[PDB]
Symmetry: C2
Subunit: 454 residues, 2 copies
């Protein structure tokens, strides 16, 4: 409930800090004047997240990184079970033999997204294996809120928050560290008796409006890890790059700059491929000796279908033996149960009648929600119950005490928040070489938000 | 000259880096939507400046800071012989009225010396600013922009085109913030309290300020590097939110009880900054408080053009500076003017007018320029020559190898550059407590921010 003028002053303080710190994005049709940018949509205050849930999300990221790395490794062998059609087509095309040894190292830059269910437990709503965004702006919104607290902007008399509870993410720096690590492992594969300064190629979308989020990684790579980079669209890839047919190494025509890492910030949706040449550009990159982040299989490993398959204890067990790690993951999954007499089905029926409010009954015509479940099933013979499945419902913690700033307008409405956990993993055909937690993100609905632990 | 495509790519690199780093400013009428900002006008490449000239400029700043501090102290003594200006002096006289409390004797000068590189190389001061000097913050950013473009292979995909050792990277944003923090601590150090005290810096700003991002760098450095908070107030805010404790004169913000240790002006140096009698009253209210002003009325007045000219005279200068060496160094930077009569400097003037005419301009105290002087003086009479004055002209080194970026339009025109040197000085009635060089600036025009490459 900020005073109307307390709020107005607070809003301009946000605009001034954000612009001064590049917490920005290009508005539509920025191509008409690329020297103008706007403040990114953000909340004014941090959103409360339970400390216990946050620590578990952070702690479990390495286990998810490893899981998807193992799934990717398994998929590289048609002797297992694990838009997607074209991607798969490109994959098969990379199987074609070449005269140079192919690049075995892959870089996975991921992000796990959770909802804080309070039917507190984190529930995974998504695991992203390709082109994850906002690692750069996340750091800035966190620092914006921290500053507003420490500079007495939230309250002229003093901080209204305990700095020890305000999360400040280093995702921008950590993602750049992951890219620098991939470049060094590329260089380390073969030394030179000449200077070698391979770079990171950012493959971007034409007319990218969120470039400033990406620029943070480019600048950290340079200033912190001495690594240079270039921004290329599928057009630029087709026009400016070439492959040494003897080594498969990727270079930029005329300049001779060598590309060690192909970092995708586009290519995760059917419209990212505007023409057939764009598909050929992707294939061309995947075939090169450069380390892809991510390569085709890694991207495919994140298919919603596979995510669904992994919610099955039996399937999960095939990739994770440890009982402890297995239970930590399943705990975060949205549970689904059949209503037959199989082992799981008996559990389903027991839950449907003992804790109905936690679920929704969906047909395999209408769904039946929560407290209406028992009565509904009572009117159907138990033998026909398997005509439906029981699905766990997520009831997120709504924040009613926050203000969303967008285009200089403030909105004081209820918001739901999604917790994002970045993760980075470097792996080859059979082993994981590097596995790390890479920062956090919080988005409400959309806009960037920050975390306050309680 | 970069190829058309090499330039468009470089322009895109500039916009991206600049926005990501806040090297920005509000466009006209930003009031409509303050959530949008544009890239500040800047050059694409750094401008060449003689290392010798740059070092002399840096080295003499402390001498200039001290000269103007002494002038101010001299002006502060009553028995001392030493329209907008009249109004300022008017306010000053008002501060002379007694009070229940002991007046604040410490003042902070945040100055900036501006020089042209005369190639007749010698630095020639064209201006000395004693109030609300700008660009200390964006200055650091344009320097880092150019360094980035060089080190990240944007100027040339094959490698840097400049020796990083010759690229000046100013810390003026940080140094100006340190000067302010320094003023805050000396304010706090005047009298202790057994209980935590955290006075702030008050930025007095212009209404609808478009160059706020340059100023924000100072605000952020103060907090992050010196743990000092601050507030942005227009003269309207000063009148509505501040109040003075009659027993101590101390300045406070109503209701919050936050104490203001330093009043830092980023407005109030030109007549249009005062939109009404109320604004003038706000200035006086601030000047009478116990807070340390940056700068106070008298320091501001020491920067008037008359005084600056009064100083170009070796006689008046010698009053505030003994050391022949310090004096000679200062005089070298001033634009010389000569009398054309039968005195000491007179014969020297005539000699110069006929020996090196191309270096001066003759003016009646129509101007007769350069190579035309001996002729003009020949047809007249020496005894009558006294009806003129010989002034040396500054023929600055033009840079024709740069590109200026403004509102996404690039200009490849020759440019003249002005080298700015920031300086901070803390002083009381008779002594100088702190005197530092505080960073550099390079502004160019056919205006925009530029950076320095030494040679």
């Amino acid at each position: 409930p900020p005073s109307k003028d307390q709020l107005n002053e607070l809003i301009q303080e946000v605009n001034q800090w954000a612009i001064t710190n590049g917490l920005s994005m290009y508005p539509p049709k920025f191509e008409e004047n690329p020297s103008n940018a706007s403040v990114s949509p953000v909340t004014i205050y941090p959103t409360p997240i339970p400390r216990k849930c946050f620590d578990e999300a952070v702690q479990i990221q390495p286990v998810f990184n490893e899981l998807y790395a193992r799934i990717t490794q398994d998929m590289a062998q048609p002797d297992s079970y694990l838009f997607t059609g074209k991607l798969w087509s490109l994959y098969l095309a990379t199987l074609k033999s070449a005269q140079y040894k192919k690049q075995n190292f892959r870089l996975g830059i991921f992000r796990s997204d959770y909802l804080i269910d309070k039917k507190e437990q984190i529930k995974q709503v998504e695991f992203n294996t390709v082109s994850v965004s906002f690692a750069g702006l996340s750091e800035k919104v966190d620092r914006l809120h921290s500053y507003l607290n420490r500079a007495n902007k939230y309250d002229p008399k003093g901080p209204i928050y305990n700095d020890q509870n305000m999360v400040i993410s280093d995702s921008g720096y950590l993602l750049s560290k992951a890219l620098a690590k991939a470049v060094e492992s590329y260089k380390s594969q073969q030394s030179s008796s000449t200077t070698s300064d391979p770079i990171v190629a950012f493959i971007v979308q034409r007319n990218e409006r969120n470039v400033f989020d990406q620029k943070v990684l480019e600048l950290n790579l340079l200033e912190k890890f001495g690594t240079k980079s270039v921004r290329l669209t599928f057009d630029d890839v087709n026009d400016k790059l070439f492959i040494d047919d003897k080594t498969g190494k990727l270079f930029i025509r005329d300049t001779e700059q060598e590309i060690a890492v192909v970092y995708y910030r586009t290519g995760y949706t059917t419209t990212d491929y505007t023409s057939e040449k764009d598909w050929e550009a992707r294939l061309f990159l995947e075939k090169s000796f450069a380390i892809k982040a991510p390569d085709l299989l890694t991207q495919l490993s994140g298919s919603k279908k596979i995510q669904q398959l992994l919610t099955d204890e039996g399937v999960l067990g095939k990739y994770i033996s440890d009982a402890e790690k297995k239970s930590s993951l399943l705990k975060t999954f949205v549970k689904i149960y059949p209503l037959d007499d199989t082992k799981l089905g008996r559990e389903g029926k027991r839950l449907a009648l003992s804790e109905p409010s936690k679920y929704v009954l969906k047909p395999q015509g209408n769904n039946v929600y929560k407290e209406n479940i028992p009565n509904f099933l009572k009117g159907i013979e138990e033998r026909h119950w398997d005509a439906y499945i029981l699905m766990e419902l997520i009831e997120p913690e709504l924040n009613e005490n926050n203000i969303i700033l967008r285009d200089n307008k403030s909105y004081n409405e209820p918001i739901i928040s999604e917790l994002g956990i970045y993760g980075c993993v470097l792996f080859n055909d059979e082993q994981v070489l590097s596995n790390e937690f890479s920062g956090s993100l919080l988005r409400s609905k959309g806009c960037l938000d920050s975390i306050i632990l309680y």
